[PDB]
């Protein structure tokens with residue numbers, strides 16, 4: 174297991190434009206295209222991302238290329254964020270993957286309300302962190318995925334993904 178395999182499980186792979194759990198146009202391995210309700214706007218974003226006229230369909234190699242870029246950018250963003258860097262740097266590699274997973278799903282703004290969870294994680298209060306993480310819109314809207322990510326933070330193992 175690693176962040177790539179973990180997100181591939183949580184996000185799936187679809188080669189045609191689809192709507193994510195929030196109803197937003199997406200492609201590949203959970204690559205958010207736009208929050209615009211315009212399918213034409215999403216198609217434009219897709220074309221821009223891939224560098225060709227895709228007509229709303231991409232290949233597996235193309236999906237994987239976007240995915241690698243997205244994981245990389247998620248990490249680089251974390252390292253540039255004064256609220257996230259300290260916690261990320263304090264974590265072991267397995268729990269780092271859990272952090273990247275959350276940022277990938279919700280974005281940095283999406284994780285702004287997690288200040289108290291973040292402190293518990295930095296403190297290595299794992300069971301307490303796990304309890305606090307579940308007190309969230311995230312947990313309620315995507316409970317199965319949230320439970321896997323939370324288990325990963327609680328245990329520092331890949332048990333939830335085996």
Ligand SMILES: CSc1ccc([N+](=O)[O-])cc1
Pocket residue numbers: 251257258260261262264269272273275276284287290291294
């Ligand atoms: C509870 S959300 C979150 C976001 C980032 C990190 N991080 O260590 O970069 C951890 C948790």
